[PDB]
Design a binder for this molecule. Structure first.
Ligand SMILES: *[C@@H]1O[C@H](CO)[C@@H](O[C@@H]2O[C@H](CO)[C@@H](O[C@@H]3O[C@H](CO[C@@H]4O[C@H](CO)[C@@H](O[C@H]5O[C@H](CO)[C@@H](O)[C@H](O)[C@@H]5O)[C@H](O)[C@@H]4O)[C@@H](O)[C@H](O[C@H]4O[C@H](CO)[C@@H](O)[C@H](O)[C@@H]4O)[C@@H]3O)[C@H](O)[C@H]2NC(C)=O)[C@H](O)[C@H]1NC(C)=O
Ligand SMILES: *[C@@H]1O[C@H](CO)[C@@H](O[C@@H]2O[C@H](CO)[C@@H](O[C@@H]3O[C@H](CO)[C@@H](O)[C@H](O)[C@@H]3O)[C@H](O)[C@H]2NC(C)=O)[C@H](O)[C@H]1NC(C)=O
Ligand SMILES: O=C(CCCCc1ccc2cccnc2n1)NCC[C@H](NC(=O)c1nc2ccccc2s1)C(=O)O
Ligand SMILES: *[C@@H]1O[C@H](CO)[C@@H](O[C@@H]2O[C@H](CO)[C@@H](O)[C@H](O)[C@H]2NC(C)=O)[C@H](O)[C@H]1NC(C)=O
Ligand SMILES: *[C@@H]1O[C@H](CO)[C@@H](O[C@@H]2O[C@H](CO)[C@@H](O)[C@H](O)[C@H]2NC(C)=O)[C@H](O)[C@H]1NC(C)=O
Ligand SMILES: *[C@@H]1O[C@H](CO)[C@@H](O[C@@H]2O[C@H](CO)[C@@H](O)[C@H](O)[C@H]2NC(C)=O)[C@H](O)[C@H]1NC(C)=O
Ligand SMILES: *[C@@H]1O[C@H](CO)[C@@H](O[C@@H]2O[C@H](CO)[C@@H](O)[C@H](O)[C@H]2NC(C)=O)[C@H](O)[C@H]1NC(C)=O
Ligand SMILES: *[C@@H]1O[C@H](CO)[C@@H](O)[C@H](O)[C@H]1NC(C)=O
Ligand SMILES: *[C@@H]1O[C@H](CO)[C@@H](O)[C@H](O)[C@H]1NC(C)=O
Ligand SMILES: *[C@@H]1O[C@H](CO)[C@@H](O)[C@H](O)[C@H]1NC(C)=O
Ligand SMILES: *[C@@H]1O[C@H](CO)[C@@H](O)[C@H](O)[C@H]1NC(C)=O
Ligand SMILES: *[C@@H]1O[C@H](CO)[C@@H](O)[C@H](O)[C@H]1NC(C)=O
Ligand SMILES: *[C@@H]1O[C@H](CO)[C@@H](O)[C@H](O)[C@H]1NC(C)=O
Ligand SMILES: *[C@@H]1O[C@H](CO)[C@@H](O)[C@H](O)[C@H]1NC(C)=O
Ligand SMILES: *[C@@H]1O[C@H](CO)[C@@H](O)[C@H](O)[C@H]1NC(C)=O
Ligand SMILES: [Mn+2]
Ligand SMILES: [Mn+2]
Ligand SMILES: [Mn+2]
Ligand SMILES: [Mn+2]
Ligand SMILES: [Mn+2]
Ligand SMILES: [Mn+2]
Ligand SMILES: [Mn+2]
Ligand SMILES: [Mn+2]
Lengths: 687, 920
């Protein structure tokens, strides 16, 4: 190909394949110097710097090195590299590039404490009177530049949420219960982010709880305003952002405001004025999960759900819909936030997932992720279970379907929550540079509209080729050949009825026919469930051009891996491959949508001793592969006597390569982590 | 598809009054006129001291576009004492819901507040007003003596309302009993006859009402929306209501019996906070006279191409079968943040095709986030998931979203055009639009060629210009049209004829009309509605025998016809519209006589052959099924030859074979039009003599009925020739087969027990599960991986109970998982304890035999055997220091399959599980 079936004119000779090429002549060898491949066009003639064979590039325009510490005047912490690549693609071509992301050791951290202040939070507001400076000492071990702030919320200050009567209850909603609580508020911002941790403890204990009627409280109103008011709250664009949501009750979701007569949809805009109160609280509905997801991602905000046990399962299933948000069990008196914040920051800094913004739909992106030492995981744009200081790499591929004249759009690739990003400037070249020649349409090829293209002349009604017009019978066939590229059978694709030395493809209906021999067409592709290219790809001459995120001959194989993801995080539970968004279990006896079910598999004892041997004896498999403390995230502590405490525990025994009997225990905690108690002094043969 | 969008009816109200928040038709029995009921809460009224009480305006279709408020209340706040109001009525949102039976209008104010008559309070109880002619009663079922938030004080009754087929109202209050929700149903007669202006809390007889429930149901918002329909055989409309916050904000939809208010069915959402139940509707969308349920989740998030979550909203379509549980599909929105399922409005039968149609509205989608409304036509097979027409709001966004589509009402023919119409309210711009349906015309046309085979040497027509005989033929184009509803009598069509459409834009045309001397012609036709397929004739002549040189290429006669806007009803430009799926063009083909023999007719001899490359089709999975065909024409040329591959119900044709040069590519197509499924393939036009074609057609069989033995394939060639136009119908079948890869796996947990056991002592009569020994677990799984399923199997476990009169592995208990019963030939756990190689051979054996039921592909069956290592027998005297391998085995035998009348012939295998006890 490129030698037939594609030589019509440039600006279309390139759209056949990234292999073809065009030419001027300075002469005109008739011969067969068609739209042929280079090194075949570079076999005959026409190479005085006239090839018109553009190659696709991935030139980087800026790649600063990855920093080691996120502190100080060696500015531009640069957690991502490179930072800007120029991408230049020809039609139906693709180029690949890489990107590295690092969890820098000492990255500034600001924590905004967003607290529910309904009456059940009275005990909580007390036990956090000094948990600001207590938090300073703890976070200081992970970041030298720490900021904190405070914000509070109750609910929409309107009926049926607010205590509206008697009139003496607007100043004391705790009126009918013989006590005092200050009037309720929508969302209150008290302290903007500051590095003075005592300034935090001062603002607390200046606060007091309020009272509400209905159980659900409007905190999504506060979560939204704390995210998009980055000016008012003072998020450092160079800092890891933590928003701590502390509540002990259900939440109001979007469209709940209809009962209060609030039907204006939430806009993701800031409405906290100089009075530090959410002014639009009574006039605007609650935000939807989709809007919160959009704005949390745009502002690089990590949402931490610090909720009580009675409602922890609820916010868990909420976090599954707001990816990147972690939930934490909170004690009834908020005596647990300090440890809960640290445990949350560790979870956040443990993952890295790439997101794509402003991607032109004309091209698609593939991802092969390298999270471990050197083992690459195809089809993944995220790495799990990392510790600060690690660095992971992703290889990316961008391929265009045809190519428009969009005027070189650009898009962004970056991880969630990070300020640093890779900006990719796309640029399409879909035509030779010779079609600007200023020889408009003229002499040598039938003054009757003629033309002069890059070296041919696509005449008007009858384009003889270098001459013109066997338009109606003028012929008495004088070039009746070359119209069947075997010349022993009907002379056309059997559609077109060759005349003029240019088979005029007839039967222009039910699609469109093209090709020099009319070999090509639409609607000649394959079907999967009855739809052409499964309704997921263009049909280009019997071949499907799959849309973005579709592969395979039938364009029925997804590139998605989310339906391959399990409740543990690993796709197919490490027991099978993920082909076309579905698992293909490899371990014998395993099955299920994520290969999670395997009742005939070995017990946990066989899987956890692999960790006891490499973490406590520095040997055995899982240490030769240097995967020991990436898979063995369990907490191990050599102890004695296995003191029979816990019912969700299993005691395991085995004989190591030293002929000694090792004994340990495995214990999990209700959505908490797991611990292995290894008995010191195993039983060895006597002297 | 037939809704007019050129000149719809424009209605507007005072700005800031949410004019259009609720809409409905008004069809009184005492008049021939019909009106629009447009609710406008926040509208100011002449009510003394009431700020933004709200209105419900009556707008007429009289073309004056004038709206007049309906006098419902006209009063201020009644007093509980001097300077102590009983009601408040300001910002009450009167008009947030408006519905009307034939002559009665019901409007509610869901934010009406009440003093409670006991303590000074302001509780949003809500009130309604039922008007019939001149009398106006007040219906406030939630304004009872059950006052506070644990009662009905925040019920906001009238949040949603509806009428049943027999003068019964369905009222929803989402605030009753700490926002659990409540449905209240009252007879319209009771509402009017028992009304007393001197009684604020009225008891009604025959009042149906849901009651309070456990606190775990709080904050569910039952009664957020309401619809009526029959879902048992009683013939009485039942109660449908959305509960968008029920079940941890998954959203639920309750259906209550319209007779005793007992629960009938439940629907549950799939995604939290998606507000499953914000909108509900009930209509028979399938023409089966069974009401079908529609549920709206405007904030539902689906997965895009990338795989991320995007908020587009989805609508749950639940068809009702006469047996009970529903057949439910889904339907997702098309834009993000558009809130697709915000309003679901039944449209009656918009196109009068015999099936009812429905409309779903995205009030924040489209251009500039103006509001979109999608029309969906009903079919026999249910609801056509592909929208048929998009209605786009035309009004800008002054202060808040125009919200075009937030409220809709249809199924009422406001004109007499015989087609129901539709009202859409914006309320963001305080407007309401009435779209009128245009009548549908179904037109069928025929095309004939006298004759279809032209003979150049048969010049019989004399050319008009010069007296020369030319080979000619006739072209007849007929036209018959008709339609239901108000229509014109004589319709104007504009038809266009094209001779030899294939050769176009550069070619020799080869055929011109006789007098026109042109390859094209036009005729202004006019026909009447009832039948009368009027026709017109024109003579076309073939070009001279030596002027085009192209034979063997059919001369395609092409007709296309359009409609002229001349004939519109007296409704000021409500012009009709052709049927959606009908072709506005038709083509016949004439062939020049060539190589048809001395008989001057082409008689072909067509022959179909199919060999059996594929042999077996395994039941249970889709299989590659390729048939290689051999179509040949050992006769004179065949005009318009086609291979007719009539397939069975399980065929699902896919593609043609390219990778072979032995078999040539073919242009095929799948089409099911008349009572049949089949695949058509072009074999040549014309298919000339000889022409031995090889081609492959791939398929994938989805087997049927589990009792068939073969699949049918009938082939034959067809052609437009007069004689011998077809080939004999050759048939080829492949046999269904049974393949079931059944396997059995086992595992021990643990597989090792190191002696001695720590902290172990000898109790000569123990019952602890701790005095016996460690727990040794044996798991056996029987799994049927194969495509075909089996119906009955046996499983035989061989357990090494004892060895020389003392226990080895004392079985405590065994559990089952799956379709399997088991029985032990010895009493398991006879002591009533509570929570080298030793096989069932050289040792004493305890058998557990199991009977297995039906196991399909993904399903399996598992036996858990929880035993105890009898430590006493080891370690004591005879087995002091010796390693023993306790061995148990399990075999299975598949005896029956659900595929009788088909070969099975066996399935059997076995495996063993070992538990090694050793001394460290
Ligand atoms: C469609 O989906 C709906 C969504 O849930 C389904 O609705 C629910 O059905 C439940 C079962 O029908 C029903 O629960 C029944 O309530 C009765 C009566 O309740 C009580 O009376 C007392 C106050 O008047 C209290 O009883 C005790 O129980 C509560 C908690 O259980 C305690 O906390 C209290 O202090 C009190 O001591 C309750 O407040 C309640 O009002 C119960 O008798 C039923 O129990 C049944 O089983 C128990 C044993 O578990 C038996 O002893 C007893 O004889 C009953 O047979 C149920 O709990 C829910 O109220 C109802 N929810 C709503 C909103 O309607 C619906 O069923 C479903 N329909 C279909 C067709 O699928
Ligand atoms: C996309 O569509 C194609 C064609 O419809 C699908 O191909 C069919 O896939 C099956 C296997 O998945 C191929 O083979 C047969 O299945 C058995 C199952 O055990 C397998 O063992 C054999 O190797 C056997 O070939 C089949 O040839 C292939 N083509 C057909 C049936 O025409 C493809 O799976 C679809 N892909 C997705 C992701 O949906
Ligand atoms: O959860 C809720 C509402 C659910 C109640 C549970 C229920 C009760 C009865 C029912 C009857 C029928 C069935 N369903 C019922 N369900 N409301 C919390 C508001 C909170 N306040 C407080 O709980 C308190 N405030 C004060 C003030 C002074 C002294 C003590 C206290 S205790 C704040 O402010 O957010
Ligand atoms: C991810 O890994 C795959 C490995 O298959 C890369 O794909 C190539 O495609 C063929 C098709 O089978 C493979 O056999 C070769 O290993 C690759 N072709 C080559 C190297 O010419 C894919 O490119 C990788 N993606 C990224 C973004 O690196
Ligand atoms: C109905 O009339 C009231 C009269 O008060 C209007 O309310 C005033 O609107 C101005 C600004 O538009 C506010 O500053 C006042 O506070 C409003 N008055 C009250 C009592 O709140 C109201 O806008 C009118 N409604 C409509 C739909 O026209
Ligand atoms: C010769 O050609 C003429 C062209 O019209 C043929 O005439 C007509 O045949 C059709 C049906 O075949 C009739 O409906 C017309 O009425 C005929 N027109 C006449 C008789 O003037 C005629 O049949 C052809 N005869 C041959 C080829 O032998
Ligand atoms: C397992 O034992 C049950 C108990 O007899 C068998 O019975 C099924 O259910 C009822 C009794 O619970 C019987 O009257 C039915 O005839 C049985 N139905 C089915 C589908 O089995 C059951 O058959 C046994 N299962 C097997 C696989 O033998
Ligand atoms: C493409 O392959 C890898 C991506 O997997 C990339 O790093 C490399 O630079 C590319 N190589 C070529 C020859 O394009
Ligand atoms: C949360 O979701 C899980 C599944 O994701 C489900 O099993 C559980 O019941 C849910 N619980 C709540 C409280 O929503
Ligand atoms: C672990 O071993 C000790 C010592 O025998 C025992 O008391 C305890 O019950 C064991 N734990 C479990 C979970 O069986
Ligand atoms: C309710 O009505 C249905 C039919 O109308 C009947 O089957 C059922 O027994 C009745 N029971 C109650 C408690 O109303
Ligand atoms: C004729 O009808 C077909 C649909 O049947 C349509 O695709 C085509 O555009 C129409 N006009 C033609 C073929 O000239
Ligand atoms: C038990 O001993 C046998 C002896 O052949 C051995 O094959 C088997 O693997 C052992 N069981 C284990 C290691 O679980
Ligand atoms: C086991 O008991 C049986 C009981 O009949 C006896 O015949 C046999 O001799 C005993 N075997 C041993 C080894 O004690
Ligand atoms: C038992 O299973 C094995 C492994 O699948 C197989 O090789 C063998 O042929 C089977 N035996 C019988 C009798 O089916
Ligand atoms: Mn609260
Ligand atoms: Mn609340
Ligand atoms: Mn508390
Ligand atoms: Mn009923
Ligand atoms: Mn139905
Ligand atoms: Mn219809
Ligand atoms: Mn109408
Ligand atoms: Mn003949």
């Amino acid at each position: 190909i490129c030698t037939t079936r594609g030589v019509s004119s440039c600006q279309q000779c390139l759209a056949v394949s990234p292999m073809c090429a065009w030419c001027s002549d300075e002469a005109l060898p008739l011969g067969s110097p068609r739209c042929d491949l280079k090194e075949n066009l570079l076999k005959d003639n026409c190479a005085p710097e006239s090839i018109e064979f553009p190659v696709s590039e991935a030139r980087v325009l800026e790649d600063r090195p990855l920093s080691d510490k996120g502190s100080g005047d060696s500015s531009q912490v640069t957690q991502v590299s490179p930072q800007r690549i120029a991408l230049r693609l020809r039609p139906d071509d693709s180029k690949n590039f890489s990107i590295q992301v690092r969890q820098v050791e000492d990255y500034p951290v600001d924590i905004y404490y967003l607290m529910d202040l309904s009456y059940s939070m009275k005990d909580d507001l007390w036990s956090i009177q000094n948990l600001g400076t207590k938090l300073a000492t703890q976070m200081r071990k992970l970041t030298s530049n720490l900021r904190i702030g405070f914000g509070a919320f109750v609910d929409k200050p309107v009926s049926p949420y607010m205590y509206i009567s008697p009139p003496e209850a607007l100043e004391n909603p705790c009126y009918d219960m013989k006590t005092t609580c200050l009037p309720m508020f929508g969302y209150k911002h008290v302290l903007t982010l500051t590095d003075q941790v005592t300034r935090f403890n001062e603002e607390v204990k200046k606060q007091s709880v309020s009272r509400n009627r209905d159980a659900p409280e409007g905190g999504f109103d506060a979560i939204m305003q704390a995210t998009v008011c980055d000016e008012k709250i003072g998020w450092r664009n160079d800092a890891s952002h933590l928003l701590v949501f502390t509540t002990d009750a259900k939440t109001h979701i979007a469209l709940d405001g209809r009962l209060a007569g609030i039907v204006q949809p939430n806009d993701g805009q800031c409405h906290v004025g100089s009075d530090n109160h959410y002014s639009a609280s009574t006039t605007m509905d609650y935000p939807s999960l989709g809007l919160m997801t959009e704005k949390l991602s745009q502002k690089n905000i990590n949402l931490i759900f610090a909720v009580t046990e009675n409602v922890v399962n609820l916010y868990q299933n909420y976090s599954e819909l707001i990816p990147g948000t972690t939930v934490g069990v909170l004690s009834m008196d908020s005596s647990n936030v300090l440890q809960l914040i640290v445990d949350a920051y560790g979870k956040i800094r443990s993952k890295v997932e790439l997101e794509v913004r402003d991607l032109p739909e004309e091209l698609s992106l593939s991802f092969n992720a390298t999270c471990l030492n050197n083992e690459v995981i195809p089809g993944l744009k995220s790495c799990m279970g990392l510790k600060i200081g690690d660095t992971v790499s992703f290889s990316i591929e961008a391929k265009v379907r045809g190519c428009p004249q969009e005027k070189e759009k650009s898009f962004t690739i970056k991880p969630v929550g990070f300020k640093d990003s890779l900006i990719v400037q796309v640029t399409f070249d879909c035509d030779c540079a010779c079609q600007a020649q200023a020889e408009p349409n003229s002499h040598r090829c039938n003054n009757g509209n003629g033309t002069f293209e890059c070296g041919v002349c696509r005449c008007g009604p009858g384009w003889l080729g270098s001459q013109c017009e066997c338009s109606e019978e003028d012929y008495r066939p004088s070039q009746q050949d070359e119209c069947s590229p075997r010349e022993g059978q009907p002379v056309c694709s059997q559609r077109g009825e060759c005349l003029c030395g240019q088979c005029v493809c007839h039967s222009s209906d039910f699609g469109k026919i093209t090709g020099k021999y009319c070999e090509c067409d639409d609607f000649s592709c394959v079907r999967y469930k009855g739809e052409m290219c499964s309704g997921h790809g263009q049909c280009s001459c019997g071949d499907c051009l799959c849309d973005s995120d579709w592969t395979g001959y039938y364009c029925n194989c997804t590139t998605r891996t989310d339906t391959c993801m399990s409740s543990n995080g690993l796709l197919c539970s490490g027991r099978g491959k993920c082909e076309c968004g579905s698992c293909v279990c490899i371990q014998p006896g395993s099955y299920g949508d994520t290969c999670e079910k395997c009742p005939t598999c070995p017990d946990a004892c066989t899987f956890k001793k692999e960790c006891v041997e490499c973490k406590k004896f520095d040997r055995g498999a899982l240490h030769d592969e240097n995967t020991c403390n990436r898979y063995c995230r369990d907490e191990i502590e050599s102890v004695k006597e296995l003191k029979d405490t816990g019912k969700d525990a299993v005691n395991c025994t085995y004989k190591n390569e030293d002929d000694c009997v090792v004994r340990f225990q495995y214990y999990e905690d209700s959505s908490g982590k797991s611990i292995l108690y290894v008995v010191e002094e195993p039983e060895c043969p006597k002297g | 598809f037939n809704l007019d969008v050129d000149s719809p009816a424009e209605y507007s109200g005072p700005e800031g009054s949410y004019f259009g928040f609720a809409v409905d038709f008004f069809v009184p029995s005492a008049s021939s006129r019909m009106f629009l009921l447009v609710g406008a809460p926040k509208a100011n009224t002449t009510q003394p001291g009431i700020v933004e009480g709200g209105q419900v305006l009556k707008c007429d279709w009289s073309s004056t576009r004038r709206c007049q408020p309906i006098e419902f209340d006209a009063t201020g706040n009644r007093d509980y004492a001097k300077d102590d109001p009983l009601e408040f009525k300001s910002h009450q949102w009167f008009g947030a819901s408006v519905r009307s039976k034939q002559d009665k209008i019901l409007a509610c104010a869901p934010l009406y507040h009440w003093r409670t008559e006991m303590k000074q309070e302001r509780e949003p109880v809500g009130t309604c007003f039922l008007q019939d002619g001149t009398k106006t009663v007040e219906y406030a079922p939630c304004r009872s003596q059950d006052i506070d938030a644990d009662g009905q004080g925040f019920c906001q009754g009238g949040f949603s309302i509806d009428f049943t087929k027999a003068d019964r109202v369905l009222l929803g209050g989402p605030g009753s009993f700490y926002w659990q929700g409540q449905l209240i149903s009252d007879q319209v007669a009771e509402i009017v006859s028992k009304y007393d202006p001197n009684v604020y809390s009225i008891k009604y007889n025959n009042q149906l009402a849901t009651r309070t429930a456990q606190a775990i149901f709080d904050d569910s918002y039952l009664g957020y929306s309401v619809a009526v329909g029959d879902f048992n055989g009683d013939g009485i409309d039942d109660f449908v209501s959305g509960v968008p916050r029920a079940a941890r904000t998954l959203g639920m939809v309750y259906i209550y019996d319209g007779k005793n208010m007992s629960s009938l069915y439940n629907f549950t959402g799939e995604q939290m906070a998606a507000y499953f139940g914000f909108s509900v509707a009930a209509t028979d969308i399938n023409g089966d006279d069974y009401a079908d349920v529609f549920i709206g989740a405007p904030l539902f998030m689906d997965r895009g191409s990338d795989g991320k979550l995007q908020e587009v909203g989805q609508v749950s379509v639940s068809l009702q079968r006469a047996s009970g549980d529903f057949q439910t599909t889904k339907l997702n929105g098309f834009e993000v943040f558009a809130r697709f399922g915000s309003a679901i409005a039944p449209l009656g039968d918009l196109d009068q095709d015999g099936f009812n149609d429905i409309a779903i509205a995205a009030p924040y989608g489209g251009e500039d986030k103006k509001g979109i409304v999608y029309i969906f036509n009903g079919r026999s097979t249910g609801l056509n998931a592909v929208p048929s027409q998009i209605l786009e709001g035309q009004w800008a966004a002054r202060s808040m979203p125009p919200s075009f589509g937030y409220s809709m009402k249809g199924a009422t023919d406001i004109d007499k055009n015989g087609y129901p119409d539709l009202i859409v309210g914006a309320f963001g711009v305080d407007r309401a639009i009435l779209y009128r349906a245009r009548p549908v015309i179904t037109v069928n046309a025929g095309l004939e060629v006298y004759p279809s085979i032209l003979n150049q040497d048969n010049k019989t027509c004399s050319l008009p210009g010069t007296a020369l005989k030319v080979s000619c033929f006739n072209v007849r184009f007929c036209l018959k049209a008709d339609g239901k509803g108000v229509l014109p009598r004589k319709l104007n069509f504009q038809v266009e004829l094209l001779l030899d459409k294939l050769k176009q834009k550069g070619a020799i045309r080869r055929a011109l009309f006789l007098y026109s001397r042109s390859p094209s012609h036009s005729k202004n036709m006019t026909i009447s509605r009832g039948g009368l397929m009027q026709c017109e004739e024109l003579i076309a002549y073939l070009r001279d025998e030596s002027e085009f040189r192209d034979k063997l290429t059919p001369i395609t006669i092409f007709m296309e016809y359009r409609l002229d806007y001349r004939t519109a009803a007296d409704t000021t430009g409500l012009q009709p519209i052709l049927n959606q799926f009908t072709p506005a063009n038709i083509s016949r083909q004439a062939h020049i006589l060539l190589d048809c023999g001395e008989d001057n007719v082409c008689k072909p001899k067509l022959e179909v052959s199919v060999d059996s490359d594929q042999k077996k089709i395994y039941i249970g999975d889709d299989n590659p099924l390729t048939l290689i065909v051999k179509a040949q024409n050992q006769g004179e040329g065949a005009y318009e030859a086609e291979l007719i591959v009539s397939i069975p119900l399980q065929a699902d044709f896919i593609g043609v074979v390219r990778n072979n040069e032995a078999l040539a590519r073919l242009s095929c197509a799948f089409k099911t039009e008349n009572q049949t499924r089949q695949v058509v393939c072009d074999l040549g036009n014309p298919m000339k003599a000889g022409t031995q074609l090889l081609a492959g057609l791939r398929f994938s069989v989805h087997q049927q009925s589990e009792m068939d033995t073969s699949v049918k394939f009938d082939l034959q060639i067809q052609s437009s020739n007069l004689f011998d136009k077809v080939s004999p119908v050759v048939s080829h079948k492949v046999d269904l087969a049974v393949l079931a890869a059944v396997e059995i796996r086992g595992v021990s947990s643990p597989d090792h027990v190191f002696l001695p056991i720590p902290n172990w002592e000898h109790k000569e009569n123990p019952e602890t599960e701790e005095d016996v020994g460690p727990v040794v677990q044996h798991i056996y799984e029987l799994r049927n991986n194969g495509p075909s399923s089996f119906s009955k199997a046996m499983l035989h476990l061989q357990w090494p109970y004892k060895y020389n009169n003392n226990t080895l592995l004392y079985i405590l208990h065994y559990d089952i998982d799956g379709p399997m019963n088991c029985t032990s030939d010895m009493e398991i756990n006879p002591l009533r304890i509570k929570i080298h190689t030793l096989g069932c051979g050289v040792a004493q054996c305890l058998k557990i035999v199991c009977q297995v039921g039906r196991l399909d592909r993904g399903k399996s069956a598992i036996l858990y055997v929880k035993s105890l290592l009898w430590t006493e027998t080891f370690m004591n005297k005879e087995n002091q220091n010796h390693s023993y391998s306790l061995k148990s085995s399990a075999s299975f035998n598949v005896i029956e399959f659900p595929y009788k009348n088909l070969p099975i012939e066996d399935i059997t295998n076995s495996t063993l599980v070992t538990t090694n006890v050793t001394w460290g």
